[PDB]
């Protein structure tokens, strides 16, 4: 297919994994755009994994289907967490860019989430 | 009402709160009895609160409605957690005892949950 693909980023956060992952799961109660909808397709609160389907009038200008999967794992003990965040997508048509901009924005979102819960 | 009431216990566990609460939410995927059904009525992954309705052949010999509510709160900074566990119920008839045996069993369940996941 020229339309289906995925893009994934791995980066580290200061927060312990269970706290970071729970905070994220809870924050998905807020749609990511005005007209948006987020549906949990898979979730494991012990493995700290989740896949969500995201939709909305804006995101669908670019992707017929957008899913996001997270996996959060402890680095050590009081050392913070590794985060893997993956977009799985089908583009509207083949000249849509891979979601580099949006995934960089997802990283910023996650880093702000980390700072929010670390300092609260 | 002669049938409606609640019974609540507060006790401490050694697990940190997010890890403990998440392990519990995840464990509700297993029914609590062979013919049991658990439904999540409310859940907050940041406040570490949840209400579940429990039904099944056994339960409904005693209660028309049995719900259970947890709140998990940090004691300090690695010092473990306070757990409040409440049964809200309507008895099948006025002569049914308040769920003392049942709740003491919940407490045992929760302390074994604590040891299981602390040591993993």
UniProtKB/Swiss-Prot annotation, chains A, B:
**Protein name, UniProt field:** Uncharacterized protein At1g24000
Choose any GO biological process term that the UniProt entry carries and state it: defense response
Organism's domain of life?
A: Eukaryota
The record ties this protein, via Gene3D superfamilies, to:
3.30.530.20
Q: What Pfam families does UniProt report for this protein, alphabetically?
A: Bet_v_1 (PF00407)
Task: Give the source lineage, highest ranks first.
Answer: Eukaryota, Viridiplantae, Streptophyta, Embryophyta, Tracheophyta
């Amino acid at each position: 297919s020229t339309l289906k693909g995925a893009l994934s980023v791995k980066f580290d956060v200061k927060c312990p994994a269970d706290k970071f992952f729970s905070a994220f799961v809870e924050d998905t109660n807020r749609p990511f755009e005005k007209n948006g909808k987020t549906e949990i397709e898979a979730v494991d609160l012990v493995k700290k994994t989740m896949t969500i389907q995201m939709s909305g009038s804006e995101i669908q200008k670019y992707f017929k289907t957008l899913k996001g999967s997270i996996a959060v794992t402890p680095i050590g003990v009081g050392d913070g967490s590794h985060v893997v965040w993956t977009f799985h997508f089908e583009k509207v048509h083949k000249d849509i860019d891979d979601p580099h901009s949006i995934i960089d924005e997802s990283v910023k979102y996650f880093k702000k989430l980390d700072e929010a819960i670390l300092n609260f």
